[PDB]
Structure formats: C-alpha cells, structure tokens
Structure 1
Amino acid sequence: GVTEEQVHHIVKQALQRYSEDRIGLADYALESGGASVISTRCSETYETKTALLSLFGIPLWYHSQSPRVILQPDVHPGNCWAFQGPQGFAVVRLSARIRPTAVTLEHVPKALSPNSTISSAPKDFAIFGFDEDLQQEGTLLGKFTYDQDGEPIQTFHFQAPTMATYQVVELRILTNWGHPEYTCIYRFRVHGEPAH
C-alpha cells in the first residue's frame, strides 16, 4: 500500500484543508468579512433571563446570544442564537454581491451535547435571495434538511442555480429536531462566485 511519505503528505493536505475554515470555501456571510445580520423579521430571541452578570454582588444584566453569533466562528456549546419555537428567520447582507452556489449550516457535535442528542438543531430550512430590498417576497434559492445524524458541519449545494447574483439572502428555518422550547443556530455560511 502506501509509504510513510505518502502518509505525511495526505496529513499535510488534510490539515491544510482543516485550517481553511474546515471546508475551504470562502464565506460571504462571515461577519468579520463584512457580512451582517440585517433583520430577524419577527423572530423572537428566546431569552432565558439566566446568565446574570454582577459586580461586587450587584446584578447588572442578563446575557443572551445576539442573533449575530450565527455569522461568527466560535462554535462551542451555547454559542448559538436561540429563538422561540421551531420557526425563525435571519436576513443576512452578505459581504459581497455573488451568485450563491451553496450554503453551510453547522451545529454543536453530538458528543459534546448532553445525552448525545441535539433536538434544538435546525431541521428543514430554505434560502431566499433578494434582488435589492428585503421587504419584497424574496426569490427561493433552495430548501434542505439539516441532518441530526450527519456530520456537525454540512454544506448544501443549490440545484441548477440561475446566474442571478444577490447580496441579501435569508435563512429561513422551518422545523427543528424536536426541542419543545427553542431552536439554536450555531453558524450559517454562504458560498458562491463573486461578480465580474
């Protein structure tokens, strides 16, 4: 079979990829790149009023995750946007106008979740692009299911994308994996071709 050198090379390549945002596709929805969440429509952040900050003993305020964590890379357990119930929206102005060719959703891995279950994960969802103004009914680009038994990061390629470019897209979460009280969104990424 293979040689000690071959192995090294395979491993170098694997770690190279690993270090390129795991999956090696640019992310036009990454916040630090110039992307942002511009609206959650009527999505009500599920506030637990649980994380009390307090100085010298005096209660200052409760922390909760901004819906903008969804465009940030820290994906430790609890670093997700939670909203009430199994349905919710996020409108993201991508850092650039692109032809969207794919998206990535990821969730905390099972082995780091209590009981190896992740009922708060999104399930069925869809992606709408908007040609300018977000208040239009937007154009649907794809509908997919986050697979609770799949890998934590999963990438969904659109079927025969038009060559229509967009800079505003909406992550519309339609179902969850059964958690009765909220859905928690860890990270959402948007890949595609920049205009020319």
Structure 2
Amino acid sequence: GVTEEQVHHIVKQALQRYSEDRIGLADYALESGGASVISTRCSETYETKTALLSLFGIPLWYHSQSPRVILQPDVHPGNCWAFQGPQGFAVVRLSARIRPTAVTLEHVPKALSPNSTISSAPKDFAIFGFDEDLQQEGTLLGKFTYDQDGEPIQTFHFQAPTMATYQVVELRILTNWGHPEYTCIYRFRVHGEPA
C-alpha cells in the first residue's frame, strides 16, 4: 500500500495545485492581470433579481452585475453576469497577445443552487479570435458544450489551433441549460502561449 508519508506528499501536491487558481494555467482574461471587457461589444445586461428589487427595494449599495464579472474570480452564488435569453456574447481584450490554446468556463456548483439545478448555466458556446481590433469577421477558434452534469470548472482545449495570436476574443453563448428567461456566466478564462 501507501505510506502515511506518501499520503502527505499527495495531499501537499493536490493543495498546491488547488491554490494555483484550481487548474494551474495562466489566465489572460483575468481582469486584475490587465484584461477588460469591451462593453461596446457585449450583450445587454439582464438583472436577475428584479423580483427581489421590486418587492423589497433597491439597496443603497446595490448594483447590477456587469460583463466585467466574468473576468473576476469571486464565483459565490449570484456573482455572475446575466443576459436575457439563451444566446449572448461578450468580447474580451486580453492582458497580452497570445496564441490561445484553451478556455475555461465555470458555473456555481449544483450543491449551492436551489433544488440542485443550474438551468441558467451556459450550454453550447463558441470562441472567436479577432485579429484586428474592429467588429470584423471573428474567426472561430472552437465550439464546445458546458456540461451541467460535470465539474463546476471545465476546461476546453482547441483542436489543432493555429499558431495565430490574438488579444481580442469573443465568448458566444448559443444555448443554455433550459432557463427560459436568462443565462448567467460566473467566470471565463483564456489560456495560451504569449511571446
């Protein structure tokens, strides 16, 4: 079997990786690293708490989640950006020009959600890279599906990506997990190789 010491080594390693933003890959969409949403180029924000703000009011500290939230690591319940319906988009200016190799999408865990369901989670999505900074023909880097039955954090690797580099990428949500009124995005990450 294993020694008590080998267990400790294993646990140490697992916690080291846990503390490296869970997945151990640099995130070029991270706002604190220098990334930003191009607000001009995102879906309109939807307020998911209209029912509570209508019945009890609008707190003096309250503000709607803006697209910036998808580049922020706090993913406690409600710290997600929502748009109306099952299709939406956000364009991100990365902190550096990179050759993109993967993205990560995460949603609140079922265990922290009412009735253990996350129907507002994104489902099918696609990633586009914008060479010039202009609402041009974005070029598809890949198409994926966030699995509502999978782990909260899911990483998607592009299949045979170009050597092409980008500093602007679009997250395009095409379907959601069935919520008939909105979709919300807890955090979006972009990984790749810089210069």
Kept after mapping to 1: 8 A contact 2:48/2:82: no
**Percent of matched pairs sharing the same residue:** 100
Distance 1:81 1:40, change over 3 A: farther
CA distances 1:83-141 after superposition (whole Å, capped 9, x unpaired): 00001110000000000000000000000000110000000000000112231011100
Distance 1:151 1:52, change over 3 A: closer
Aligned alpha-carbon RMSD (Å): 2.6
CA distances 1:64-92 after superposition (whole Å, capped 9, x unpaired): 10111000000000000000000111000
Kept after mapping to 2: 8 A contact 1:127/1:143: yes
Distance 1:92 1:48, change over 3 A: same
Mark the runs of 5 or more structure 2 residues left unpaired by the alignment. Answer: none
Classify the secondary structure of the residue corresponding to 1:58. coil
CA distances 1:162-196 after superposition (whole Å, capped 9, x unpaired): 1000000000000000001100100000000012x
Distance 1:161 1:51, change over 3 A: same
Kept after mapping to 2: 8 A contact 1:52/1:60: no
Q: Shift of residue 53 of structure 1?
A: 9.1
Kept after mapping to 2: 8 A contact 1:107/1:186: yes
Counterpart of 1:16?
Answer: 16
Q: Kindly indicate which of the two structures has a greater share of residues assigned to helix.
A: 2
TM-score scaled by length of structure 1: 0.92
Counterpart of 2:119?
Answer: 119
Distance 1:190 1:58, change over 3 A: closer
Distance 1:141 1:112, change over 3 A: same
Question: d(CA) in 2 for partners of 1:5 and 1:60?
Answer: 53
Number of residues of Structure 1 aligned to a counterpart in Structure 2 = 195
